[PDB]
């Protein structure tokens, strides 16, 4: 009708105004400003430890708070907690559903969250008087496969699923308290701000959105990619975040100014990106492609500064310790590697 | 070198490894099948014939344990989760050949037969299923033979010239399904006709699975 056409025209002219306002504040690029900083030398990393025991495909892993323990999830229906320094196994949790796609470790080291392809997120309690590991709560209410889950606190959790919606739950009650909507395609990854107040998410419609936990409604939207977004991560400062897509390109955004700061890509790489992570100081960026190896960049000049080529299949998960002592990489060949 | 509280941890890790290996040895004694279709193709009827988020079914037939996965209720983007089913023994694809006259609810122009053929083409020529066997079930043929006399088949295929009988129509549909393959060397398609009342579908599945197992065993030893 006429009202629909006039509202669409209004939306188009607001989009034009937003584009003009964004282009107004663009004065310089990061490369020009960082053109005088000395370059970091060639980085050499060696496989200090190799973790074995999984007999299927490994899909996710998460570091602990003390930078000693990590948890990993495999399609053999198993969730394994490791001991990085001594290369030992602490706990092995069976799963009712073997189609796992994500895992999360509580910051207090008390609970572990797991879910995927079953519309259910299960919480497991580690410290039990009985001596075993038991499931505490099964959150249900999603109509699509769960893509990501992160512990907001010891009692709150944030989940992102394949039904184009994000949810914030309450473990003791078992019911949703806030729902975030606005994505057209499925949502793949989310990252939490260091102050535990905001979080960004990425969707298959080549877009990222910022959300506030308290209000529960969106604030900003970032576009620029040409394919699906597979990974996302915050800067240690909290004023920027990096996104990786399937079109062989990584991008770094900013919060105060909604622009493109720098892009990372090469002519010799035509493959997608699965995981992206930062360093403790923010000078160093790591990204794991599916061409059987990882790659490393200087975050301020966009130049490769080392290759962690040690895997025989696609790299799926990558993590960095809180103290920045070592990095961990998992892949489809059922192997974890620690680099220092 | 190790203290008194590290040897116990090492022993616990060894026991965990032993139990994990023992439990993982048992998961290789299962024949995994993935069931697909076009919604109203008749999945439920076939499931209740062969049986005495994601749906899982168990059954046994002559000392063989089957593991059937139905994923029809996902209603999500398939290319984002289709790579989980890499080492599946076989795909079971159900089609109702009595829906050539009808058309889809979403679009009156597009018919269900073309949608089924397009989905079959998409699944068959994927980069993850280069050497995966496909079994094709054509169900509800009695309604098809009762309806073929009233209405011609030229509606779905305008380039058809036949006697408009049951046998020729069934053969033509079978050939049309078979012609979409693009490998013909490392991929095999098995076709069968069935109605509501039958007792011989499980035997067909058993024969196809036996052939796949023989091929895998030959390839493992290097003799193939």
């Amino acid at each position, epitope marked *: 009708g006429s009202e629909l056409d006039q509202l669409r025209q209004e939306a188009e002219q607001l989009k034009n105004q937003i584009r003009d306002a964004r282009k107004a504040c663009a004065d310089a690029t990061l490369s020009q400003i960082t053109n005088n900083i000395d370059p970091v030398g060639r980085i050499q990393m060696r496989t200090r430890r190799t973790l074995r025991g999984h007999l299927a495909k490994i899909y996710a892993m998460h570091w602990g708070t003390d930078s000693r323990l990590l948890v990993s999830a495999s399609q053999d229906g198993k969730l394994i907690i490791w*001991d990085s320094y001594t290369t030992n196994k602490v706990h092995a949790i069976p799963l009712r559903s073997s189609w796992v796609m994500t895992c999360a470790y509580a910051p207090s080291g008390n609970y572990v969250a797991c879910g995927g392809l079953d519309n259910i997120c299960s919480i497991y309690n580690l410290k039990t*008087r009985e001596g*075993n590991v038991r499931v505490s709560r099964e959150l249900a209410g999603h109509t699509g496969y769960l893509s990501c889950c992160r512990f907001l606190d010891d009692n709150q959790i944030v989940t992102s699923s394949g039904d184009t919606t994000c949810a914030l739950w309450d473990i003791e009650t078992g019911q949703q308290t806030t729902t975030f909507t606005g994505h057209t395609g499925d949502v793949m990854s989310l990252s939490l701000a260091p102050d535990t107040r905001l979080f960004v998410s990425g969707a298959c419609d080549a877009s990222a959105k910022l959300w506030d936990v308290r209000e529960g409604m969106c604030r900003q939207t970032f576009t620029g990619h040409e394919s699906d977004i597979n990974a996302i991560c915050f800067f240690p400062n909290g004023n920027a975040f990096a996104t990786g897509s399937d079109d062989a390109t990584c991008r770094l955004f900013d919060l105060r100014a909604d622009q493109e700061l720098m892009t990372y890509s090469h002519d010799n790489i035509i493959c997608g990106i699965t995981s992206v992570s930062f360093s403790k100081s923010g000078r160093l960026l790591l990204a794991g492609y599916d061409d059987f190896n990882c790659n490393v960049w200087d975050a301020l000049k966009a130049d490769r500064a080392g290759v962690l080529a040690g895997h025989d299949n696609r790299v799926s998960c990558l993590g960095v310790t809180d103290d920045g002592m070592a990095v961990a990489t998992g892949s489809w060949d059922s192997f974890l590697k620690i680099w220092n | 070198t190790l203290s008194a509280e590290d040897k116990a941890a090492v022993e616990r890790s060894k026991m965990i490894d032993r139990n994990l290996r023992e439990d993982g040895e048992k998961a290789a004694r299962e024949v995994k099948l993935l069931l697909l279709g076009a919604g109203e193709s008749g999945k439920n009827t076939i499931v209740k014939q062969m049986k005495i988020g994601i749906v899982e079914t168990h059954f046994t037939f002559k000392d063989l344990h089957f593991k059937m996965f139905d994923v029809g209720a996902q209603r999500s983007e398939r290319k984002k989760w289709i790579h989980c089913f890499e080492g599946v023994t076989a795909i079971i694809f159900c089609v109702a050949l009595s829906d050539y006259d009808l058309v889809l609810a979403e679009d009156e122009e597009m018919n269900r037969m073309h949608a089924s053929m397009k989905l079959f083409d998409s699944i068959c020529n994927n980069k993850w299923f280069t050497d995966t066997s496909i079994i094709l079930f054509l169900n509800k043929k009695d309604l098809f033979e009762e309806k073929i006399k009233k209405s011609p088949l030229t509606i779905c295929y305008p380039e058809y010239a036949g006697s408009n009988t049951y046998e020729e129509a069934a053969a033509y549909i079978q050939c049309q399904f078979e012609d979409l393959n693009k490998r013909k060397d490392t991929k095999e398609i098995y076709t069968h006709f069935t109605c509501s009342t039958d007792t011989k579908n499980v035997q067909f599945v058993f024969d196809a699975v036996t052939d796949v197992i023989i091929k895998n065993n030959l390839k493992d030893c290097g003799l193939f």
Partner: single-chain antibody
Amino acid sequence: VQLVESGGGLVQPGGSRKLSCSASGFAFSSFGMHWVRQAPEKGLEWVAYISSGSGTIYYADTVKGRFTISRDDPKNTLFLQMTSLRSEDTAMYYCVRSIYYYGSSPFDFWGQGTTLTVSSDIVMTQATSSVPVTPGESVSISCRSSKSLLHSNGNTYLYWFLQRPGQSPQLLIYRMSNLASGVPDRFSGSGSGTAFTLTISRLEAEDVGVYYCMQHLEYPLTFGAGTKLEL
């Protein structure tokens, strides 16, 4: 969670007998078991240890060759067989759980005890034997050894626990710095090298009893003479 012990009676100076204990409320197959002996009006000492999977079995020098340990996981029962008994084997026997991984707290449950009556090593020294106290004032207890308990990995293997009158011992502090579960924050532990101190800020009527310190570097585990507190 509960452990019940039985099989303790009166025996002749020469004979044999078996003691049994049964578990209820926890996964018995994943816990190692310890036997502890406490002489009448004396201290308590370690006897034997059996591990999960029945792979490692450790005995004490004074009972080596005469005591046998056995485990039944299907039925959740621990047996101890005594084939030769002297006149010094009259005491009360307790069964203790233990779990070993990073962050575990061994010697957490002690259960009850059963009475039996018959008709190199690290020395743990506690000079203090009795201290009078009025509620509302802090108390400090000292424990010393002969060899440093600090290992190359950075851990110190010292344990502090309590025994109330007419009751089973309860764990207080493990690894000389970590507070156990179910105990108040009043208790604290510290120390370095060979010297160790346990401090109680505020004392109530439930803090009266005997205190013990233990080491866990190597077998056998050696206990210290108890430190009594009187009101």
